[PDB]
Amino acid sequence: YALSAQQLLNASKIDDIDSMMGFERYVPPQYNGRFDAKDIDQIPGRVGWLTNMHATLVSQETNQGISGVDFYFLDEEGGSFKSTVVYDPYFFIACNDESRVNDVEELVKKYLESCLKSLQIIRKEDLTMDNHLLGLQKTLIKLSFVNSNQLFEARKLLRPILQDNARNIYNKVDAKHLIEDIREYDVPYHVRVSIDKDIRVGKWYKVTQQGFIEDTRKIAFADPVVMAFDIETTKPPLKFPDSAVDQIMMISYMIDGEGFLITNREIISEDIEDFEYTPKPEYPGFFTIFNENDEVALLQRFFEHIRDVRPTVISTFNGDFFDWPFIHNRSKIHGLDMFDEIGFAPDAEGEYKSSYCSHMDCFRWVKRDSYLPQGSQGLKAVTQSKLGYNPIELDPELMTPYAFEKPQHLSEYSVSDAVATYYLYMKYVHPFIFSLCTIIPLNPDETLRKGTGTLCEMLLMVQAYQHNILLPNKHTDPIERFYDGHLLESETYVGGHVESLEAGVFRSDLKNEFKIDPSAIDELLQELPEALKFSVEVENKSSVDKVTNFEEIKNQITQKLLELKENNIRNELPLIYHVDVASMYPNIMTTNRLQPDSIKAERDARKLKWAWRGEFFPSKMDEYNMIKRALQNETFPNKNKFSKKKVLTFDELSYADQVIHIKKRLTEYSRKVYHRVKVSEIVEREAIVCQRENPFYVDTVKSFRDRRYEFKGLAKTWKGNLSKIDPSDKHARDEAKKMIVLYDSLQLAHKVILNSFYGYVMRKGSRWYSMEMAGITCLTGATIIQMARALVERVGRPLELDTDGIWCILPKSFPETYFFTLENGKKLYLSYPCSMLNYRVHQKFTNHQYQELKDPLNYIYETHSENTIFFEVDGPYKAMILPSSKEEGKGIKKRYAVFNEDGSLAELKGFELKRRGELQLIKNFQSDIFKVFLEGDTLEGCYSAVASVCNRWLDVLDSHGLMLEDEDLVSLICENRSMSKTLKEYEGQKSTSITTARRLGDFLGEDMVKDKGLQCKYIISSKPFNAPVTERAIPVAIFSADIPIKRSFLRRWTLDPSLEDLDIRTIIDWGYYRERLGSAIQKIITIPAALQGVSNPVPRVEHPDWLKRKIA
DNA sequence: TCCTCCCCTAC
DNA sequence: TAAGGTAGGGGAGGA
Ligand SMILES: Nc1ccn([C@H]2C[C@H](O)[C@@H](COP(=O)(O)OP(=O)(O)OP(=O)(O)O)O2)c(=O)n1
Ligand SMILES: [Ca+2]
Ligand SMILES: [Ca+2]
Ligand SMILES: [Ca+2]
Ligand SMILES: [Ca+2]
Ligand code: NA
């Protein structure tokens, strides 16, 4: 009430912004006809490309706003407009008693009186309901409203009634007790409109008086006006900038391929000149300069320029977190209004959004969709990886000084950030997101930023809606859970399977010893015919009938196999192969028809197992019960500072908070008495997957899988292509290489979303929660990969295994690739080691119970066999190096290096080199070391070459760093560690990051550690002696402080007052670093060297005793 | 020697 | 207030 006044004032303000920027609210010509989408052209109205959409309140051309959505269009004529749909918000009440429905209808029609606009009886399929497969629907009351405000009040009015639900004791029930639950009450409005109306951003539409008519003719988006900007500010030495005090010394940016720079000459010592920055032909960048007087000349110039070009997309890089908020503040102090200026402002999440223009923050794409590791999510590494060139770097601390000192080069660097950001946006973020919008009921701002789980839920809501299925409410996690009287600390299911089986060096040129099992060779022979058939019909989708050389090929293989049976002990060059199941979990789901609503609790079939794993306290109910009364006797603080009541009973805390104390009180009691905090126990469990249920969920997974397989296909064609034709150099292909990066990126950017269909069943607030399904997917996978390993174990050596992949060696004698010939001359490709696995998967893991609706009207189901699980193969490779543990008998999982034959790095997994932070010495040393495994011409020769490098590095550290320039040394010895939260939120915890952060607070001021995500860069020191490692962490920033400053703290931290030497060398605990460098040499070189019968190739690093002992 | 925390990778 | 999952390496503390 009365707050519609607000939004209509605001909605109105937006309407003026939209008009300023070129979106006049357009209304289609009146027409009362019966148009056929066939004849769209005949119909009066405007054709536009939908580029955006937002919820707004609208004035009646009582007196309260009407809710609707503004849809932002670009038209075929290079213009823009916005059209508005209105649509009453709604949600449902569901009831226990089907019979008394009109009863409740009358109650609420009056009880809600004040806010209700309409009311109605509708029917939706509820999968929670018995025999809905026979056609039975749940009956609901559709509650509609004039605006979302009114809808919220209705919820407020039913809150009471709902909780209450959940006289003459010697005893026609009241209409209140029948209201069991409301439904679809938390669907965001604009989503509600996009789904029901079936409108998507990114699609073409003719706006007519009937509604939006999709023009399926138009292929290709329209070309919005894209601007990308990056700002540079003044920093203090060693500190973060402050919008409070510091100035925007420049603002570089691009607009449809044309650079601009805006300098603030109150900082820039000279009028900068127009210049060309063009990292590559594909990326031309000529800039124009707007040297401006002070801060505000630049600001206003910026805004004027936005207004001028009217951009629908403004892109940045972490602009939400830094760039925008800066600008905003510098705008206020200069007394400008940014909202009035260009119509941008922060939303409820502190993120900066406009109405007419999307703010595409590329960092969001990198974080979520790039599949890059966090250590490579900076604009430089992103640029290197995704753009293929080396961006300009500049030490942050020099950016201010160079403003005066070397201005033009500072300006050169700034345009680089923009060129990167702009072409990263246009080449990756733009197509991906906007295409994503064509299937997801979100606008670009949201399609870029929502969790992938949320992207999945949206898709599933469409699918459920269009099938007339009623949405389950969001799941809420339970307060506490028990197992055998024990309070469960945590519980889950056993995930994927991971094995480290062999360490060492493996090269296509160094023979390896094989111990083949003739038995296994037998089986492959007996299977061969049916397997070869499988490859043709299934893997390639043909018939053996059209096959020319099915028989030649069968013996080529057979000969080699037989040879291996007799000659089963051999010694030859290895084929270094990798096999990996394509979209494993999604295909396990779609194969077994796994979906949350198919898991029935005995009522009311495919039995599949999973493995539950609980982590519980050793204590029991009595001890649990005992602990509570003790806790009932205490006081706690009132969380809600909106009350003057400061002290709270235990029973007054939420059940939620209660359980926290109980846990932390019971954890200690457990410790003293039992005397462990957790017990873990694994229980095999079984579940029933009904095979006839509405497959709307699993169908959605299938649709999105197929969407990714295509990208995965042609990205294999261009990999396919490259290898032959364009590998002849000279060439500007190069282009083939550029296709692959772009497709593998698209297929990869789908990968996390796809696999989130699996994770979604486990997410908080999931509408489709099922732990059973998630467990079943994982146990099936574990079973499949262990079957594969067991086979390879017998015809080669598996080196490492993770969830759905095996790295292995096979003997060169093992049959590999062949081609089937057709009557048509076309050739079908076969990789026997792959297809040999796949035939076996399908023999054992096929779903023979898969059912489907052939006849919906007659409810007739047909049964058939489903299986879409396939290993695919890559390689063979030139080399794979695998680390080994320091602890005996244990290995290292999820770490290795693989090299192509052309000598390039195929894959680096897991190592510190790739990780964010870590000790830089180790990163560099690892960078150095791996390629050296490609040398020597014997095994021990290989370790020889690799040791030499080890020794140069040991030297540097034994040498106490005397060999190293000061600027180089300070780089190598740094360790960078990200604090995930803020220092304060760690209280009672000891870490090198904490200490460093602490000290970085005093040296520079608590303004340094205010925010989250602080990068603590530190060294270890010898002094104070004896002090635990977490105590000797020193902020590298000190050695850049002016001397008097460095003294006090060095003195303060070293805990020795006398000291007056300030060389970083005097400080460093070299014994620390020699040792961390030694552990790496051990795991990566010497200990793997051992396991292959090679004496310690780096004797300056001594074996572990246990490994010495094993020597004898 | 083991567990536990945290960050960040691998699936 | 919005929010996919589990398995693992390894540094560092302490039971
Ligand atoms: N971000 C990820 C990566 C993987 N997985 C789970 C589900 C995957 O199916 C399984 C296998 O990992 P892959 O990396 O092998 O994933 P796919 O098999 O799904 O991908 P590809 O088609 O590249 O083989 O692990 C996951 O849940 N989330
Ligand atoms: Ca920036
Ligand atoms: Ca896979
Ligand atoms: Ca894999
Ligand atoms: Ca671990
Ligand atoms: Na390692």
Numbering used by the authors: 30 to 90, 110 to 214, 220 to 224, 232 to 664, 678 to 1185
Please give sentences taken from the publication describing this entry.
Also, the protein construct we used contains wild-type residues in the exonuclease domain, as opposed to mutations in the Pol2T:A structure (D290A/E292A) which renders it exonuclease deficient. To prevent degradation of the DNA by the Pol2 exonuclease activity, we prepared the protein-DNA complex in the presence of Ca2+ (rather than Mg2+). The refined model of Pol2G:C consists of residues 1–1187 (with missing segments 1–29, 215–219, 225–231, 665–677) of Pol2, nucleotides 1–15 of the template, nucleotides 2–12 of the primer, incoming dCTP, 4 Ca2+ ions, 1 Na+ ion, 147 solvent molecules, and 1 molecule of ethylene glycol. Most of the contacts to the nascent G:C base pair occur from atop (Asn828 and Ser829) or from the minor groove side (Tyr 645, Tyr831, and Gly832). By contrast, we observe Ca2+ at site B, coordinated by residue Asp290. Surprisingly, this motif is partially disordered in both the Pol2G:C and Pol2T:A structures.
The bulk of DNA synthesis in eukaryotes is carried out by three polymerases: Pols α, δ, and ε. Polε is believed to be the leading strand polymerase and, like Polδ, achieves fidelity via both accurate DNA polymerization and 3′→5′ proofreading exonuclease (Exo) activities. Pols α, δ, and ε belong to the B-family of DNA polymerases.
